[PDB]
Structure formats: structure tokens, C-alpha cells
């Protein structure tokens, strides 16, 4: 299957900022929650999504909210002297992970996975990026200048991407996530935020 990116960048890129969770936004990362959650029910099988991360954004989700719930979690770690849990995956790359889940989450699983998201850091992005079967991006664009130190690996809401990236229209992002969404700009707590869905041709 295809993989789907889901991040949350400045104008500029900016991923992260100085300090921790440099952007509070209760209802963006609700949009975080039902995007990378939403599958459909069958009676026959369990339905799931999987989430893929780096360990520093496996260390950065409170305790309460971790691993993220009803999801599949697998952490990315080369040198993994990590101590991960029972029913959490770790592998040491992006392939990897992928051969351990088909692996895993085949024919005979009562348990089937639903969707695959890339949810970062910025090197997971940058190997996401590079893969052939990345073919989606679901990007909330904040309309702030915050002093960020990490940055989004390619550029791709600008001209130079254009013939290859395209912007879907508003209503192909609610079919994809299965909810009707607000359009145009949010504003939460004094940032603005638009929700965006791009795809690549494979
Ligand atoms: N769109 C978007 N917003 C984000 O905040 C985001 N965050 C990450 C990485 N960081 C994080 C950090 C915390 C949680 C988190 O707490 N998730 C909970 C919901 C928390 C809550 O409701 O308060 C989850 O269950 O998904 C997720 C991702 C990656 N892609 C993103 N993409």
C-alpha cells in the first residue's frame, strides 16, 4: 500500500520550535487524532491504522497519550537500546518496518491494517520523502512566523514542485477523511491554520 504523510509546518517550513510543543492546538491535533484514526468497520476483521515514528516524537507524546491509542505504533530506531512495550514495534528504518508489518498483518491476521502515516521527525520525513510509495501528504499549514529550528525536507507547496505535488480540492479532502472539514483559515489561539491534502502521481 501507499504511505501518507501527516505534519503540521510554518509558511516557511518550520517544523519545531526552541521549546516543547512550541504550537498548543487542542483542536488541530483533534484533526491529528481522527485523520490518523478513521477506519472503516467490517464484522468479519479488526480494521487498523498505523502510525510510523522517529523516537524523539515517540518521547514527546505525553505519557496518558501514549502509545497512541487504537492505533498501530512502530518507532524507528537504528541502534534501539530503546525499552519499547508489549504491542509496540520498533525496526531501523522505513523498509523495515514495512517487511515487519506485512510480515505481521498478513493473510492470517484477524487484525488488517487500514492506512500507513508517516507522523515524523524531520529525518523519518526526509526518508518518507525518497520512498516510492509515498503518494500523500496531509499538511496544516500555519500561517505564523515561529522561530523553528527544524524544517520540512522538500519544498513542496512551492512552484518548483508544482507539475509533480498538486493541491486537492476541499471536498476530495473530507471524501479521504470521511468528515466534512472547515475551510479556509482557523484561527486557534491566536494562530492561523489551514488544513491541506497534496498528492504525487506513482
Ligand atoms: N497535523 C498535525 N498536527 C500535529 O500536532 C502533529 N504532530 C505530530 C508529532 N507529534 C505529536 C505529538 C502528540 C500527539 C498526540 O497527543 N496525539 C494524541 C491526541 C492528544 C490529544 O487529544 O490531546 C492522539 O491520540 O493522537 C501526536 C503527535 C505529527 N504530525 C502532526 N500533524
Same mark, same amino acid.
Given at each position: 500500500?501507499?504511505?501518507? /504523510? ?14 516543547? /510543543?512550541?504550537?498548543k492546538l487542542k483542536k488541530e491535533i ?21 502510525? /510510523? ?10 505519557? @496518558?497519550?501514549?502509545?497512541?491509542? &487504537? ?7 537504528r541502534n534501539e537500546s530503546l525499552d ?9 528504518? /522505513? ?16 487484525? @488488517? ?9 524531520? @529525518? ?5 520523502? =525518497? ?13 505564523? =512566523? ?31 477523511? &470521511? ?18 491534502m497534496w498528492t504525487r502521481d506513482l
Amino acid at each position: 500500500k501507499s504511505l501518507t /504523510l501527516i505534519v503540521a509546518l510554518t509558511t516557511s517550513y518550520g517544523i519545531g520550535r526552541s521549546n516543547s /510543543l512550541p504550537w498548543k492546538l487542542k483542536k488541530e491535533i483533534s484533526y491529528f487524532k481522527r485523520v490518523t484514526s478513521f477506519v472503516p468497520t467490517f464484522d468479519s476483521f479488526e480494521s487498523m491504522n498505523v502510525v /510510523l515514528m522517529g523516537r524523539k516524537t515517540w518521547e514527546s507524546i505525553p505519557l @496518558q497519550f501514549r502509545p497512541l491509542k &487504537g492505533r498501530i505504533n512502530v518507532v524507528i530506531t537504528r541502534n534501539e537500546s530503546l525499552d519499547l512495550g508489549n504491542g509496540i514495534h520498533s525496526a531501523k528504518s /522505513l523498509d523495515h518496518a514495512l517487511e515487519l508489518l506485512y510480515r505481521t498483518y498478513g493473510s492470517e491476521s484477524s487484525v @488488517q491494517i487500514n492506512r500507513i502515516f508517516v507522523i515524523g521527525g524531520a @529525518q523519518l520525513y526526509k526518508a518518507a520523502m =525518497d520512498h516510492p510509495k509515498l503518494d500523500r501528504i496531509m499538511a496544516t499549514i500555519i500561517y505564523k =512566523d515561529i522561530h523553528c529550528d527544524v524544517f520540512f525536507p522538500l519544498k513542496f507547496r512551492d512552484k518548483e514542485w508544482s507539475s509533480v505535488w498538486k493541491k486537492e480540492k476541499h471536498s476530495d479532502l473530507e471524501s479521504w477523511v &470521511g468528515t466534512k472539514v472547515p475551510h479556509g483559515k482557523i484561527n486557534e489561539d491566536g494562530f492561523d491554520y489551514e488544513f491541506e491534502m497534496w498528492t504525487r502521481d506513482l
